[PDB]
Coordinates of C-alpha atoms and ligand atoms in Angstrom, one line a residue:
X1 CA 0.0 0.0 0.0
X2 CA 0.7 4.0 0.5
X3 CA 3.9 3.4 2.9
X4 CA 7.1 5.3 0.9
X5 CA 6.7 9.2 1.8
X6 CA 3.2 8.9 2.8
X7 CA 1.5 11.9 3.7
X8 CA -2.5 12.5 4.6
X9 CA -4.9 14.2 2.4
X10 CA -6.5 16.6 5.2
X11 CA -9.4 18.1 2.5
X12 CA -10.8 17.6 -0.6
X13 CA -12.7 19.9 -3.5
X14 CA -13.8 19.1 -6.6
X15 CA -14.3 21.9 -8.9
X16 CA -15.6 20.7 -12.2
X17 CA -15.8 16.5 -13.4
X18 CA -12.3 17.3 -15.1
X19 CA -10.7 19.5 -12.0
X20 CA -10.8 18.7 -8.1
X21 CA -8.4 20.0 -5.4
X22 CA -6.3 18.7 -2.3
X23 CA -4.2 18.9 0.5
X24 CA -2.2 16.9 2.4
X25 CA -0.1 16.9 5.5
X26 CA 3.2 17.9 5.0
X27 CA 7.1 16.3 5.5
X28 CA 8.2 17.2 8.7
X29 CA 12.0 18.5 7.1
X30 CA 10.7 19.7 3.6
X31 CA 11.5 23.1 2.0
X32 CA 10.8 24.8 -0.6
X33 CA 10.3 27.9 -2.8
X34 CA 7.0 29.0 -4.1
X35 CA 6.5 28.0 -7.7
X36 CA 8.8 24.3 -7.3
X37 CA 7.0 21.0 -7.9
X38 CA 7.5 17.6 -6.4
X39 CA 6.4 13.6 -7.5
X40 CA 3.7 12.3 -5.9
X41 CA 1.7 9.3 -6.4
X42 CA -0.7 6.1 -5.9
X43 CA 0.2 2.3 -6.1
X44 CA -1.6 0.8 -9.1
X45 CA -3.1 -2.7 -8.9
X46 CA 0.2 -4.7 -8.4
X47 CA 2.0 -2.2 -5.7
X48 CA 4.3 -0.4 -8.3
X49 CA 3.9 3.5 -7.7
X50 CA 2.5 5.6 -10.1
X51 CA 4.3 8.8 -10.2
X52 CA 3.7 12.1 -11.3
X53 CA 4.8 15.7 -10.9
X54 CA 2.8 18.0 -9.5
X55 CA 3.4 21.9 -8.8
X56 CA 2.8 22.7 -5.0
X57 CA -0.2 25.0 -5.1
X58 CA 0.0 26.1 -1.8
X59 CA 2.6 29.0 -1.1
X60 CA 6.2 27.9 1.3
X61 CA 4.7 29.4 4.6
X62 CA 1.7 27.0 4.7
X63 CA 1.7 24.2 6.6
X64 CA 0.0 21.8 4.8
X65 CA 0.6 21.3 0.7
X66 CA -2.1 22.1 -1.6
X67 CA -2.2 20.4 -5.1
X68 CA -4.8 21.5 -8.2
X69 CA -5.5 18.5 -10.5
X70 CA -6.9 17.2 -13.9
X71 CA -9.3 14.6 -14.0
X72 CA -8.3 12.2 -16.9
X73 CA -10.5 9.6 -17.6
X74 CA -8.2 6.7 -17.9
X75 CA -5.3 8.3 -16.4
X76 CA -2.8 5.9 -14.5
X77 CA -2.9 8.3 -11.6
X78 CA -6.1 10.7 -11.6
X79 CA -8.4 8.1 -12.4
X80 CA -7.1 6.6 -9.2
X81 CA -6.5 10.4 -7.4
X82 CA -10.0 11.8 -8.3
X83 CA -11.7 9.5 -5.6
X84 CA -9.3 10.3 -2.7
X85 CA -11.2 11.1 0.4
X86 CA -9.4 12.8 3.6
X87 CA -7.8 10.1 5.9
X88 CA -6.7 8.8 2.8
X89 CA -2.7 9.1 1.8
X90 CA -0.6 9.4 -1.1
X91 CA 3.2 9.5 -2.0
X92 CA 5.3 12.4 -1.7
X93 CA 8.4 12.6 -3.0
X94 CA 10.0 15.9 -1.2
X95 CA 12.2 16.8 -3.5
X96 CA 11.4 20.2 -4.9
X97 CA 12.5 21.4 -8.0
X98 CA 11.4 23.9 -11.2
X99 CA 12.4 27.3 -12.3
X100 CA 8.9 29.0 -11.7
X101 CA 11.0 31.0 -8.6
X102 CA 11.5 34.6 -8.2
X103 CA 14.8 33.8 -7.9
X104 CA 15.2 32.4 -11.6
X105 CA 14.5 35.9 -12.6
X106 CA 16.6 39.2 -12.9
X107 CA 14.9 41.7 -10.0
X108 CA 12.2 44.0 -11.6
X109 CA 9.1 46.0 -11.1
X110 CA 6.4 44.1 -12.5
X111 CA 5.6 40.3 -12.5
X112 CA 3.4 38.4 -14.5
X113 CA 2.0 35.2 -13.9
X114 CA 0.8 33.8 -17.6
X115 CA -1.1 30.6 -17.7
X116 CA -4.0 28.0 -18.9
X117 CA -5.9 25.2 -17.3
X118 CA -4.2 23.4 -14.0
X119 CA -0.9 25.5 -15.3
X120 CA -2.4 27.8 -12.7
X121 CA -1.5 25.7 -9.6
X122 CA 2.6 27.2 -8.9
X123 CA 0.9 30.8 -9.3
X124 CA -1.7 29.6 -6.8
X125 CA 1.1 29.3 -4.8
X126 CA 3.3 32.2 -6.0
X127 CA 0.0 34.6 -5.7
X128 CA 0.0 33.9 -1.9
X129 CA 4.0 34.4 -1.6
X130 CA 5.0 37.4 0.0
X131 CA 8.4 37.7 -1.5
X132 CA 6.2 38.3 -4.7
X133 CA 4.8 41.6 -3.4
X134 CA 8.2 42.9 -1.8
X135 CA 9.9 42.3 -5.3
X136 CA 7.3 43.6 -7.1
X137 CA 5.1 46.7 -7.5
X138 CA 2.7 44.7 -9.6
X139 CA 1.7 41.1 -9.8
X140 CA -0.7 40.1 -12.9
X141 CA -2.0 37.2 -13.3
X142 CA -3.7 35.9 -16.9
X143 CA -5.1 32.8 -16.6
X144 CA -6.8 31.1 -19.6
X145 CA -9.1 28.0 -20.2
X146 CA -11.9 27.0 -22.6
X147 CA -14.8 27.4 -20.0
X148 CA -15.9 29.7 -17.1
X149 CA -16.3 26.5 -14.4
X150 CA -12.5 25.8 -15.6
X151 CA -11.5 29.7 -13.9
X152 CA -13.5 29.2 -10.9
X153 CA -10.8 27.5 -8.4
X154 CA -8.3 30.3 -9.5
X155 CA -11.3 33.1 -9.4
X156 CA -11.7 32.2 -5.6
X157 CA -7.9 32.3 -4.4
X158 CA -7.8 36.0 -5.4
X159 CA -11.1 36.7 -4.4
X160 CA -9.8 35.5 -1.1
X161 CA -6.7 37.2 -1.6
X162 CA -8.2 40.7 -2.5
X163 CA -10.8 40.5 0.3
X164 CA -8.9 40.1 3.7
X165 CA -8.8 42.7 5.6
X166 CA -4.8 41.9 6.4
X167 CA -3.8 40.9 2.9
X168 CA -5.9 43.0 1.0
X169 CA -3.5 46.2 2.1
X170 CA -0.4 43.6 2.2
X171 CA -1.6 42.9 -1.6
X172 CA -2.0 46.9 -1.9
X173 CA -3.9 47.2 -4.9
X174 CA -0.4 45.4 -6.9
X175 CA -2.4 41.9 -7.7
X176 CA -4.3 42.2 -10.8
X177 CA -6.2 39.8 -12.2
X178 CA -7.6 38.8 -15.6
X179 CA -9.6 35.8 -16.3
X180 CA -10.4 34.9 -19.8
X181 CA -11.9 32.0 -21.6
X182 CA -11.7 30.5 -25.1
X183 CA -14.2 29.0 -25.9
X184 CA -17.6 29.7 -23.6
X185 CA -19.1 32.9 -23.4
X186 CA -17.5 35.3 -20.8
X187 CA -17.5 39.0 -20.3
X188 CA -13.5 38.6 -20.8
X189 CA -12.2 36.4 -23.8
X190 CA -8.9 35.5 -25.5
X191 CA -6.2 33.4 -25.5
X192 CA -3.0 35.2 -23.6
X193 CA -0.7 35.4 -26.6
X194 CA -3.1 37.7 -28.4
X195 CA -4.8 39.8 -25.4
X196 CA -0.8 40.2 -24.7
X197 CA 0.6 41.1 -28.3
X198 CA -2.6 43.3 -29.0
X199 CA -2.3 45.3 -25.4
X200 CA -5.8 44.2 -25.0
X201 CA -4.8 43.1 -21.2
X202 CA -3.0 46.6 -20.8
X203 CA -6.5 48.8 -21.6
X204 CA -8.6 46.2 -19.5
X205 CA -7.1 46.4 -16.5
X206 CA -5.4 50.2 -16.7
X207 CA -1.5 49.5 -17.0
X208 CA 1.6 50.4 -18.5
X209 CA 2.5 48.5 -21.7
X210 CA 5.1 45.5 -21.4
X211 CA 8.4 46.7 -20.8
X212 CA 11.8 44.5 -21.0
X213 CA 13.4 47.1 -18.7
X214 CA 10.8 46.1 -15.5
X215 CA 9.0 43.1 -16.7
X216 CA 9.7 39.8 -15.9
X217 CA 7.1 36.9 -16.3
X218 CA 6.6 33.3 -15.4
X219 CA 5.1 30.9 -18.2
X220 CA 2.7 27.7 -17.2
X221 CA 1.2 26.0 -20.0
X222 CA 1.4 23.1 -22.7
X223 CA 4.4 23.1 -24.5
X224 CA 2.0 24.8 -27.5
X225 CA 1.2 27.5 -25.3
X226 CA 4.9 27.9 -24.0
X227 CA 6.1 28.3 -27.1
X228 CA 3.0 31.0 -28.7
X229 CA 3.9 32.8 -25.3
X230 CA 7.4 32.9 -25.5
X231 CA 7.0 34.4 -29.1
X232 CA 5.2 37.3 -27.5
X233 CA 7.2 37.4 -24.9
X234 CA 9.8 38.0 -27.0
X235 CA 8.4 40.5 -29.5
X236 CA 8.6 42.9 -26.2
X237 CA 12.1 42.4 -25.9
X238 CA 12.0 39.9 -23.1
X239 CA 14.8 36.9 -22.7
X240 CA 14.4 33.6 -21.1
X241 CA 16.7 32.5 -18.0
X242 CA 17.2 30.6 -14.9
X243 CA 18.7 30.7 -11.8
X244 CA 21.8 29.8 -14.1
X245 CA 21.8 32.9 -15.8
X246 CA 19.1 35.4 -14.8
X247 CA 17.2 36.8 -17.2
X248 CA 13.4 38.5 -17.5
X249 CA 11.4 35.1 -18.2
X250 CA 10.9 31.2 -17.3
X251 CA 8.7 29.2 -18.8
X252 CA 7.7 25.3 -17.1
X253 CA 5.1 23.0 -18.9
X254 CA 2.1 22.5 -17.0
X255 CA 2.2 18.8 -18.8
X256 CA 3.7 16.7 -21.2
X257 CA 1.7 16.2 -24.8
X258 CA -1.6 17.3 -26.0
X259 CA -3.9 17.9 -23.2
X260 CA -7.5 17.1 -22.1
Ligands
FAD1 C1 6.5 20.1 -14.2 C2 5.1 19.4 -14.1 C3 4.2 19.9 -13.3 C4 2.9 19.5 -13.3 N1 1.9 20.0 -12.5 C5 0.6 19.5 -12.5 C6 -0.4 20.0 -11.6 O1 0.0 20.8 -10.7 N2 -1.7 19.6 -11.7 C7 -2.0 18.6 -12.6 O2 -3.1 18.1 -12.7 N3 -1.0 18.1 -13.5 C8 0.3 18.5 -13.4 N4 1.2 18.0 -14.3 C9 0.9 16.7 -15.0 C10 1.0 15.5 -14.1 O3 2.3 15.1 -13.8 C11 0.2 14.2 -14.6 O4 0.4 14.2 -16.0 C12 -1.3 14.2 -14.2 O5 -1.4 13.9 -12.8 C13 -2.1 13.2 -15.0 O6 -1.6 11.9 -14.8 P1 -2.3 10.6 -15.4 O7 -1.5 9.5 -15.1 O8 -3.7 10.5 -14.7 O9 -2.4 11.0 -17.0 P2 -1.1 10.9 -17.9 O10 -0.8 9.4 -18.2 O11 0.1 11.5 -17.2 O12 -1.5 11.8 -19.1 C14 -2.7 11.5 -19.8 C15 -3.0 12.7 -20.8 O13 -3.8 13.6 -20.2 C16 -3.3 14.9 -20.5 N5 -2.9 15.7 -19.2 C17 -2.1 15.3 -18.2 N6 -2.1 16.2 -17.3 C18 -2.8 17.3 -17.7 C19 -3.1 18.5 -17.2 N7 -2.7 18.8 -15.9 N8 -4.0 19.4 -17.9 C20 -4.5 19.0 -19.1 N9 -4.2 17.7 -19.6 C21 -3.4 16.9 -18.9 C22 -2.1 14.8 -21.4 O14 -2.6 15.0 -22.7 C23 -1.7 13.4 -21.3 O15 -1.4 12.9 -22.6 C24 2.5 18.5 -14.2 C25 3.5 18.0 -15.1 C26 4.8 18.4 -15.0 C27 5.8 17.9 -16.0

């Protein structure tokens, strides 16, 4: 069973029959930076661990881990994962790693958090990191995905965000946020590459155009959406880096292949 790094799922959410979220206790000597992602897992039917990476959607000061996940129908893992119930356990490999960290990028005055679908889940984590806001004058975050029930999990951790009384000033009117969708009818539409290359998301929400001098952004998406948005990127001026060399972009995939 659930014995190597087993930790407790403490709550459970599901969001949509594709999307469900979940936390679980966490290792005693882990650390980490928001943004980093770990393996976790299930045994399949003959005890061999089925193991996955998952971004850590809660930020580095909470005490339990949070993780937002797809549903695949037939997926080794979240055909298994989508039924977990608390007092249930998984594996967790705590072994953190990724280049979605403030770190990886050269210091600026603006950060922007680009993403689609569960490609969300390190900004859920990064949007509730303080170092974020000390960086950083401005924190945007564009998240993008076919339907409106697909925003709704990333709609209600900055609603929570922007409401509390004590984070609300600590978050001093610097995290913006803009919600689109694709596909479904929504008062906001578009994918990110062209809302960003147009200057669409600069008249919406009221704020300087893109500028390589300041700017610095974090992509989280399919490998076709990293590469559209590192195009744009780009056109601005911007250069991708790492904590190897610094520059005034990273980019991670939020999975491997086509997508569901
Ligand atoms: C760096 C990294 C971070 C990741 N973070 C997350 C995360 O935080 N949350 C999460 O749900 N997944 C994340 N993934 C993907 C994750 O590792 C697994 O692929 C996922 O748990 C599904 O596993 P599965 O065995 O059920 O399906 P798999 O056998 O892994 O894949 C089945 C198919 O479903 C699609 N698919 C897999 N994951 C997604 C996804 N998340 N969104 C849309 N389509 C998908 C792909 O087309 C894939 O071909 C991450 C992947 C990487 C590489």
């Amino acid at each position: 069973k659930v014995l190597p790094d087993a930790q407790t799922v403490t709550s459970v959410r599901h969001w949509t029959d594709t999307l469900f979220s979940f936390r679980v206790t966490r290792p005693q000597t882990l650390r980490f930076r928001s943004g980093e992602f770990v393996m976790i897992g299930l045994l399949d039917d003959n005890g061999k661990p089925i193991m996955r990476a998952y971004s850590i959607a809660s930020p580095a000061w909470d005490e339990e881990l949070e993780f937002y996940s797809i549903k695949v129908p037939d997926g080794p893992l979240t055909s298994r994962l989508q039924h977990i119930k608390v007092g249930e356990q998984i594996i967790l490999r705590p072994k953190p790693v990724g280049t979605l960290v403030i770190d990886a990028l050269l210091p600026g005055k603006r950060l922007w958090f680009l993403a689609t679908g569960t490609g969300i889940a390190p900004f859920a984590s990064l949007m509730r990191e303080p170092e974020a806001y000390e960086k950083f004058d401005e924190v945007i975050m564009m998240h993008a995905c076919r339907t409106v029930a697909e925003l709704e999990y990333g709609r209600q951790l900055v609603e929570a965000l922007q409401e509390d009384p004590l984070i609300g000033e600590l978050v001093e009117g610097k995290l913006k946020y803009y919600p689109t969708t694709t596909r479904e009818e929504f008062h906001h539409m578009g994918r990110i590459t062209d809302n960003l290359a147009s200057g669409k998301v600069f008249e919406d929400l009221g704020i300087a155009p893109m500028n390589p001098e300041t700017d610095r952004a974090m992509v989280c998406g399919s490998l076709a959406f990293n590469v559209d948005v590192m195009k744009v990127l780009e056109s601005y001026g911007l250069r991708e880096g790492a904590n190897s060399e610094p520059r005034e972009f990273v980019v991670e995939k939020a999975f491997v292949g086509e997508g569901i």
